[PDB]
Design a protein around this ligand. Structure first.
Ligand SMILES: [Cl-]
Ligand SMILES: [Cl-]
Ligand SMILES: [Cl-]
Ligand SMILES: [Cl-]
Ligand SMILES: [Cl-]
Ligand SMILES: [Cl-]
Ligand SMILES: [Cl-]
Ligand SMILES: [Cl-]
Ligand SMILES: [Cl-]
Ligand SMILES: [Cl-]
Ligand SMILES: [Zn+2]
Ligand SMILES: [Zn+2]
Ligand SMILES: [Zn+2]
Ligand SMILES: [Zn+2]
Lengths: 21, 28, 29, 21, 21, 28, 29, 21, 29, 21, 28, 21
């Protein structure tokens, strides 16, 4: 999940898009 | 280890920019 | 609670606060 | 939807909570 | 105080209201 | 343990939403 | 310092920065 | 008050500091 | 990515996200 | 500059990236 | 020790206020 | 650099000005 993936490492715009509808 | 509540605050703003009109679901 | 237009990032931050553990859906039309 | 109700117009706290899960 | 109460645990809207005027 | 300066930044925005026209006092 | 209308959450964040250790009061009319 | 001076109008840094404790 | 006017602090936050490791310059006219 | 292109008008993602280093 | 990504997010907003029309450069 | 100076201690407006153009 986004918190596991993106809180201790930086999710780029590209990675963050996975979490979009 | 980072404060989840602060991280979540940041992530929902970033998701807002990235997702635009697609929108998104978020749950802590 | 504030009585104002909430838009864009401010709306999603409001949702984040108000919904707490429940979470939310931001699905603009 | 949420933009029409809370951005274009003004939402109450109760109205904003309609978009919680 | 709010920092002691609300930085290491999450204060809901309901708890945060204590700190309002 | 969380950075107090970052936490405070967040808390004053949350207080703004929650308090509305009541307003609030804040001191670090 | 920025020369602009500061409103809502932006105003309170300005106050937070500018006032530092002194703190501030946000008491809209 | 602060809305009239800094939101409705524009505040200087000095003017904003009138609302510090 | 959002399709909207980005101004002030929102513009600099967009830049921060979009530019990532590259960084950015915010040099208004 | 960036205000004219992305604030006054609307920027694409590509246009915003013109201000990355 | 504070999350650099969250700190940076905060710092660029603060720099925006402080710098105004001077602008600023930022790199993580 | 600003991250080294201003992430574990608070940089005032006065210190932050060093990082302006
Ligand atoms: Cl963010
Ligand atoms: Cl992010
Ligand atoms: Cl705004
Ligand atoms: Cl919150
Ligand atoms: Cl907040
Ligand atoms: Cl909070
Ligand atoms: Cl600050
Ligand atoms: Cl980001
Ligand atoms: Cl900030
Ligand atoms: Cl700062
Ligand atoms: Zn805003
Ligand atoms: Zn919060
Ligand atoms: Zn700060
Ligand atoms: Zn981010």
């Amino acid at each position: 999940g986004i918190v596991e993936q993106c809180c201790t490492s930086i999710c780029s715009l590209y990675q963050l898009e996975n979490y979009c509808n | 280890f980072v404060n989840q509540h602060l991280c979540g605050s940041h992530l929902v703003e970033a998701l807002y920019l990235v997702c635009g009109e697609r929108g998104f679901f978020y749950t802590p």
